[PDB]
Amino acid sequence: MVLYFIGLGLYDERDITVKGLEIAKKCDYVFAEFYTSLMAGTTLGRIQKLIGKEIRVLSREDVELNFENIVLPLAKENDVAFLTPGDPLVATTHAELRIRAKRAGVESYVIHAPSIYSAVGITGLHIYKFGMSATVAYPEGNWFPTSYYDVIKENAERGLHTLLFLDIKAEKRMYMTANEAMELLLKVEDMKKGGVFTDDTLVVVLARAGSLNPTIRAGYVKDLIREDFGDPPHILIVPGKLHIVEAEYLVEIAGAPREILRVNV
Amino acid sequence: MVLYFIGLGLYDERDITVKGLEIAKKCDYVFAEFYTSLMAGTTLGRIQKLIGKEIRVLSREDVELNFENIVLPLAKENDVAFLTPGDPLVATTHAELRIRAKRAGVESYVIHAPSIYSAVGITGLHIYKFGMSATVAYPEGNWFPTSYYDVIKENAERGLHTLLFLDIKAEKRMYMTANEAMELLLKVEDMKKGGVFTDDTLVVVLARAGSLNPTIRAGYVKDLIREDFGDPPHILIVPGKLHIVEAEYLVEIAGAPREILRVNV
Ligand SMILES: Nc1ncnc2c1ncn2[C@@H]1O[C@H](CSCC[C@H](N)C(=O)O)[C@@H](O)[C@H]1O
């Protein structure tokens, strides 16, 4: 009579922790959602095969409006698992689902998995130096989101790095590329003119973290804006002031222009 | 010819990912370090038994000073693994180790695992709202470090949460407790008087993240400073102003006083 929130990790079915797998294998019912992120290296069947169970996939509406009608009822007489990409409680509104479980008299446990939030460490940028995070959302109709531009500004101002999650329209199979994010940001700079994001801004692109060969690229917007970083998902990072070793890693591992080695302390 | 940076995850031997375990099992040599952090819910013996390989433990000096003489030589003609608690490359100086590998003509791949940077999402605090992170260090002799106090100040000022890592002396196996961290901060506040950390400050304590039964507590310093949060490791967080949903989580899941619903929102 329990509910397990189990993260599946970054790229494929093997990114789940051993703990998550052994527990998932023994659950009576297994649900999952794949709209909060993209696991570009696996498939549902591959996942079902590994866990050895049938997985009922839920839409954003099933979860947000009917979690307590579809999932919680079964958790009262059985052990239920709710699988999600990355870590189940990161950059999502899933934490509130634990409140729903509590109110329905269901105990819940959380099994973590690798998250893009810590995976950014592979960019060479010190993780403690990351400031507030944000999401670049697709404009819709006459609505053009821009708050993420202010986040970058506020962080950069403090010498902190900015992690930018990119938009996703799962039902439309749409995954915002770093290129599209850069285009949108230049447009916002054009509007606000704060000098926050321009053709000369240094950025870092991390694509398909979790795979053995992710694409890690660093450089000026003017040079990367049209570069092909491979299939999604992508995340964009706008570094703040760099430490010598961060610059060195970006140049040696991410192919950044050797000129960034010369930091303006 | 290949070096694998493999994370062991948060708490015990089952926190490594399926991908990480399988890769580690195919490596000719396996190294590990436990000075950046320790796996409090397991032992080297249990990790060794699970991986089915003997594990050579390296000290901080072994890694920082001689990584290229101890680990890289073997990586030239064998598959080598380097295990670390949490997610690889999160520890500040680890990213640079990949540069050493490149310089030695050794290929390196990163296998991610759960990190406290993302696991703190279990506190119900929105991940995007976290600002710069810091480590609370013990004062020693004539040295009284307080930069972590300024980090909290700058974050809270902008409505951001502050993740605080607590001092650890791996070799001596001694952990700074959340209780001690609070005492130090109150002491730092008495000196700087910036109105950053007082008896009325709301804090969150996370202990044994990764275990199936972690300790998650939220409340004011005056009530938690002498509370028993259990065995280490402990993580201290000083939230900025809360979203009502964050406050509700803290009350319903972390036993926070209902008072935060009006005071810290
Ligand atoms: N493997 C990966 N590589 C690059 N970006 C990724 C990624 N996985 C997730 N993301 C980024 O994060 C967004 C989803 S946000 C949800 C994050 C998830 N709970 C976690 O713990 O990672 C995506 O739209 C994308 O921009």
Tell me, yes or no, whether A25 and A77 share the same domain.
Answer: yes
Contacts of B113 in chain A (CB under 8 A): 17, 114
- Indicate whether B96 and B207 sit together in one domain: no
Do the Cβ atoms of A114 and B212 come within 8 Å?
A: no
Of B56, B81, B114, the one marking the end of a domain is B114
Residue type, B126: H
Positive or negative: CA dihedral B45, B46, B52, B56: negative
Q: Do B4 and B98 belong together in one domain? A: yes
Structure-determination technique? X-ray
Q: Give the resolution value in Å.
A: 2.1
Structural domain containing residue B255? 115-265
Q: Check which CATH number belongs to the domain holding A3 and give it.
A: 3.40.1010.10
B185 and B257 both lie in a single domain = yes
Contact A25, A52 (CB under 8 A): yes
d(CA B93, CA A219): 22
Examine the domain organization and report whether A107 and A133 are in the same domain: no
CA distance A56 to A21: 17
Task: Assess whether A106 and A55 both reside in one domain.
Answer: yes
**Burial environment of residue A147 by CB neighbours within 10 A (0 to 12, 13 to 18, 19 or more):** exposed
Of B114, B133, B150, which residue sits at a domain end?
B114
Q: How many CB atoms are located within 10 Å of the residue B70 CB? A: 14
Question: Is residue A143 domain-shared with residue A170, that is, in the same domain?
Answer: yes
For residues B84 and B126, membership in a common domain is answered with no
Residues A6 and A36 in one domain: yes
**What size, in residues, is chain A?**
265
d(CA A237, CA B173): 36
- A1 and A86 assigned to the same domain: yes
Collapsed DSSP state (helix, strand, coil) of residue B168: strand
Q: Is A175 helix (H, G, I), strand (E, B) or coil?
A: strand
Task: Choose the final residue of a domain: B68, B90, B114.
Answer: B114
Query: How far, in Å, CA of A94 to CA of A102, rounded?
Result: 13
Q: Which distant-in-sequence residues (6+ apart) come within 8 Å of A48 by Cβ?
A: A54, A55
Residues A53 and A123 in one domain: no
Pocket of ligand 1 (CB under 6 A): A 10-11, 36-37, 85-87, 90-92, 115-117, 165-166, 168, 206-210, 233-235; B 118
Interchain contact B243–A (C-beta under 8 A):
no
Identify the CATH number of the domain in which residue B212 sits: 3.30.950.10
In angstroms, rounded to a whole number, what is the distance separating the alpha carbons of residues B190 and A155? 28
Q: A104 at the B interface (CB within 8 A)?
A: no
Cis peptide before A233 (omega within 30 of 0): yes
A131 shares its domain with A256: yes
State in Å: Cα B19 to ligand 1 middle: 18
Indicate the number of domains in chain B.
2
Residue type, A255: G
Query: Which residues are paired to A143 by β-bridges?
Result: A140
Give the DSSP letter of residue B35. S
